[PDB]
Symmetry: C3
């Protein structure tokens, strides 16, 4: 069946996207952990170096800065990256549609 072959093509596209989303999530977890470690060490350095004491903080808060973005310090204990977890709401709706179709 040509019908069967087209369903298989759709299934491959769906599976390749799901695997790529998982792979990107895994990669970003490694990047996030690494960048957070650099933030922690940079803060630890700053706290142990008296020659840096006169340097002011920019006091630019996270969200305003993300929308608007030396000098002054930009990195603070508010700079840590949170985990990235991609929504599967669309894929879940597709899965619900398939279960229904399957008669």
């Amino acid at each position: 069946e040509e019908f069967s072959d087209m369903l298989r093509l759709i299934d491959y596209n769906k599976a390749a996207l799901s695997k790529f989303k998982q792979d990107v999530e895994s990669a970003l977890h490694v990047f996030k952990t690494t960048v957070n470690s650099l933030i922690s060490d940079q803060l630890l350095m700053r706290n142990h170096l008296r020659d840096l004491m006169g340097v002011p903080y920019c006091n630019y808060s996270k969200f305003w800065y993300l929308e608007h973005a030396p000098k002054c310090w930009l990195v603070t204990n508010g700079s840590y990256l949170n985990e990235t977890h991609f929504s599967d709401q669309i894929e879940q709706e597709a899965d619900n549609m398939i279960t229904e179709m399957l008669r």
Copy 2:
């Protein structure tokens, strides 16, 4: 219609990819802003620490280094990350094909 159901499956795959591209773009903007802040603070530190004055710069330019990649300094004011914006050229061509099909 089986026809209608298959169009719906294609539509879900298309929408899930578009949402994931937007989500990745949002995530990379946060990562980029954070890494740029670490570059700025690292440069600010270097400029205020006399014990680092004898350390040379590698003088490896961005593009050659990206293709070829302590020691000497690697990070400079040329290291800042630019914004990432993913092409939708293929999706735009698909949208043009759909508008036409729709008779």
Copy 3:
């Protein structure tokens, strides 16, 4: 043919995903190179600043930390990011199925 039009829609979804995977791989290579340069410079700084000599290393190894994640140093010469290359196993299986279908 409606058949021909649906194959074209599947082809656009497949191509848009392949292009996006390539684009993400290109972007992550730039981010990875940049973060590795920040690690190298942070290590170089630490090695030239006597005021940091009493600061201990956390001695948290990469894999346990990635699963479990100042203080002590988190960044070491074991923190460098490796290259990210996304599997195309599913897409390769789809390509093999298409070659076969094509009679």
